[PDB]
């Protein structure tokens, strides 16, 4: 169906230990494809997907520029924000930028994003209309009004409607075997007695993509919010993800509970029993 491209930038200032360190990462849907580390040896944006290196030298020395410039901009921004709240040069602070775009099944445009954060808290964001911004604090108000003066939202808009959808299109069709893949969650149940009167049933869903998932335990088909446990979906370390959901059953009543797995790379929602 729909698809996404996100760029996550984090730059944290190292006071005393030279310059700030700066990390950036690119994702298409739930699949990373590029990397750059300030502490890296290559000092150049590296590939982590198999389809992105069919792009020639036109591209690596391009984005390496686009993003070292962003690195120095984030440095100066670290100083500016250090002054904005009367903060001390001794402390270590962080700046993070998320931006990207969404496409539909036809490759249409539906949404673009850009959000900034200072020390984990939101600073300034550009709204869904790509016209105005929101300022969380009152320093994001000076950054805001200054950006309204130079019409920065129009430049973030020409990017988000331009090359973000172009790049997302190109990458969607270029890693076609890898990016429109799925994996119907390989599921399996588990039974572990604790008392002579209670056990635990663990509904397992492993190897699935995209991360989107829904595990639901039911009793007599009644949704169970009571004695359950639900992990957060974990990366299985190989582009696919894992998850499980446990419930505590009175012994001899295991066959009254049913696990229901709702993955979308999968035609009909599952129902498992002991």
Partner 1 sequence: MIQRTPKIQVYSRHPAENGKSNFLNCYVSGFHPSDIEVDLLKNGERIEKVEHSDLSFSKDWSFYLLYYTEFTPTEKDEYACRVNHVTLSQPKIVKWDRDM
Partner 2 sequence: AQDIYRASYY
Q: Which residues bind partner 1 (CB under 8 A)?
A: 8, 10, 12, 23, 25, 27, 32, 35, 37, 48, 92, 94, 96, 98, 117, 119-122, 188, 190, 192, 202, 206, 231-232, 234-238, 242, 244
Residues in contact with 204: Cβ distance below 8 Å, sequence separation at least 6, in sequence order: 187, 188, 189, 190, 244
Closest approach of partner 1 to the CB of residue 154, in Å: 26
Q: Where does 152-226 have alpha helices with state H?
A: 152-161, 163-174, 176-179
Distance CA 217, CA 212 (A): 17
Going by the DSSP 8-state scheme, the letter that residue 253 receives in this structure is: -
- Choose among partner 1, partner 2, none what residue 274 binds, the Cβ cut-off being 5 to 8 Å by kind: none
Pick out residues in 211-270 that bind partner 2 (CB under 8 A).
Answer: none
Provide the mask over 171-210, with x wherever binding to partner 2 is found by CB under 8 A and - wherever it is not: ----------------------------------------
* H or E element, residue 165: helix 163-174
CB atoms within 10 A of CB 133: 21
Cα 128-209-189 angle, rounded to 5 deg = 130
Cα within 13 Å of Cα(259), Cβ side:
29
Query: In the complex with partner 2, which residue's Cβ is closer, 124 or 203?
Result: 124
Going by the DSSP 8-state scheme, the letter that residue 181 receives in this structure is: -
Query: In the complex with partner 1, which residue's Cβ is closer, 122 or 198?
Result: 122
* H or E element, residue 150: helix 139-150
> Is position 76 an interface residue for partner 2 (rule: CB under 8 A)?
yes
- Choose among partner 2, partner 1, none what residue 166 binds, the Cβ cut-off being 5 to 8 Å by kind: partner 2
Query: In the complex with partner 1, which residue's Cβ is closer, 176 or 188?
Result: 188
Tokens, residue 152: 């920065």
Residues in contact with 166: Cβ distance below 8 Å, sequence separation at least 6, in sequence order: none
Binding-site ranges for partner 2 (CB under 8 A): 7, 26, 63, 66-67, 69-70, 73, 76-77, 80-81, 84, 99, 123-124, 139, 142-143, 146-147, 150-152, 155-156, 159, 163-164, 166-167
Residue ranges of the annotated binding site for a peptide antigen are 7, 73, 84, 116, 143, 146, 159, 171
Residue ranges of the annotated binding site are 7, 73, 84, 116, 143, 146, 159, 171
């Amino acid at each position: 169906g729909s698809h996404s491209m996100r760029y996550f930038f984090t730059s944290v200032s190292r006071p005393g230990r030279g310059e700030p360190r700066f990390i950036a990462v690119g994702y298409v849907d739930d699949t990373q494809f590029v990397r750059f580390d300030s502490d890296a040896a290559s000092q150049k944006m590296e590939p982590r997907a198999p389809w992105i290196e069919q792009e020639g030298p036109e591209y690596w020395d391009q984005e390496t520029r686009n993003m070292k410039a962003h690195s120095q901009t984030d440095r100066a921004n670290l100083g500016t924000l250090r002054g904005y709240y009367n903060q001390s040069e001794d402390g270590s602070h962080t700046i993070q930028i998320m931006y990207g775009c969404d496409v539909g099944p036809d490759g249409r445009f539906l949404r673009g994003y850009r959000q900034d954060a200072y020390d984990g808290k939101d600073y300034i964001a550009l709204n869904e209309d790509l016209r105005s911004w929101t300022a969380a604090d009152m320093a994001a108000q000076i950054t805001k009004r200054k950006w309204e003066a130079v019409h920065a939202a129009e430049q973030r808009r020409v990017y988000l409607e331009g090359r973000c959808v172009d790049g997302l299109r190109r990458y969607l069709e270029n890693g076609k075997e890898t990016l429109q893949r799925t994996d119907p969650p390989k599921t399996h149940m588990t039974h572990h007695p604790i008392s002579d009167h209670e056990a635990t049933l663990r509904c397992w869903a492993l190897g699935f993509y995209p991360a989107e998932i829904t595990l639901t335990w039911q009793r007599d088909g009644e949704d169970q919010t009571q004695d359950t446990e639900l992990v957060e979906t974990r990366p299985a370390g190989d582009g696919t993800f894992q998850k499980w959901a446990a419930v505590v059953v009175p012994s001899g009543e295991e066959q009254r509970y049913t696990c229901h797995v709702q993955h979308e790379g999968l035609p009909k929602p599952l129902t498992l029993r002991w």
